[PDB]
Amino acid sequence: SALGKLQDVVNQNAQALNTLVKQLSSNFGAISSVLNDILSRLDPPEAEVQIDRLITGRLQSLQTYVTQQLIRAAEIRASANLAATKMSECVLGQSKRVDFCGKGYHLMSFPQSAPHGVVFLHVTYVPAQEKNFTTAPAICHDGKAHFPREGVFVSNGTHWFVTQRNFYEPQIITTDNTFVSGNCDVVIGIVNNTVYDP
């Protein structure tokens, strides 16, 4: 059932065509479904009534078919616009819109063609094997408050490090992965440690 979305369109169109063809076999109130029998077995000035009955029935059937087709083509157009946007935005670039190109953090995408459609293979980075640490918003040293440039402060129980937020890789707290702002009084949660000068 993987390609159900592609198969349903074909099934619906075929079924609509079969219904339209089957409607050619209904009286709609006349004597017969066949024009030849209405013509031979009847008189000219009164066969017109049965002919008109058939005309109205068949014309109405055609009308309903065409209306259904227009309504369905609108939906197909919307789907094709979405597919074009995804091709332009997940394949020719790297996307930041969450859940647009796959599930997770988008890296790249590849297209493949299918009978009346397209298939995208989305490549994604999923984080794994989480561990828990103690953290703090700032570090106090020399009566000054220090914040990290591009990471977080973590502690393995006894020592403090600076790490990037998406992958554990601890490092020594230094005066070049850290910036200073204000004194040690306003931030709530600050802790005491040493900021090694290199």
Ligand X SMILES: *[C@@H]1O[C@H](CO)[C@@H](O[C@@H]2O[C@H](CO)[C@@H](O)[C@H](O)[C@H]2NC(C)=O)[C@H](O)[C@H]1NC(C)=O
Residues that bind ligand X (CB under 6 A): 140, 156-159, 192
| Of the candidate residues 38, 139, 154, 195, the single one contacting other proteins (CB under 8 A) | 154
Size of the site for other proteins (CB under 8 A): 107
**DSSP string for 77-114:** HHHHHHHHHHIIIIISS---STTTSSSSEEEEEEEEEE
The pattern of x and - marking residues 152 through 181 that bind ligand NAG according to CB under 6 A reads -----x------------------------
Residue position matching structure tokens 């890296």: 107
Which residue, among 138, 120, 150, 149, has the nearest Cα to 183 in the 3D structure? 138
Per partner kind, with CB cut-offs from 5 to 8 A, the member of ligand X, other proteins, its own copies, none near residue 116 is: other proteins
| Of the candidate residues 39, 49, 62, 172, the single one contacting other proteins (CB under 8 A) | 62
Does 100 interact with its own copies (rule: CB under 8 A)?
Answer: yes
Rounded CA gap, 101 and 78, in Å? 18
Shortest Cβ 52–its own copies spacing (Å)? 6
Rounded CA gap, 142 and 20, in Å? 87
Rounded CA gap, 170 and 161, in Å? 5
CA geometry: angle 157, 163, 167, nearest 5 deg: 105
Distance of CA 158 to the CA centre of its chain: 46
Does 99 interact with other proteins (rule: CB under 8 A)?
Answer: yes
Which tokens in the block code for residue 183? 């004194």
Does 143 interact with other proteins (rule: CB under 8 A)?
Answer: no
| Of the candidate residues 40, 45, 46, 70, the single one contacting other proteins (CB under 8 A) | 70
| Of the candidate residues 134, 174, 175, 194, the single one contacting ligand NAG (CB under 6 A) | 134
Which tokens in the block code for residue 140? 């106090």
| Of the candidate residues 7, 32, 63, 194, the single one contacting its own copies (CB under 8 A) | 63
Which residues of this chain interact with ligand NAG, rule CB under 6 A?
Answer: 132-134, 157, 188-189
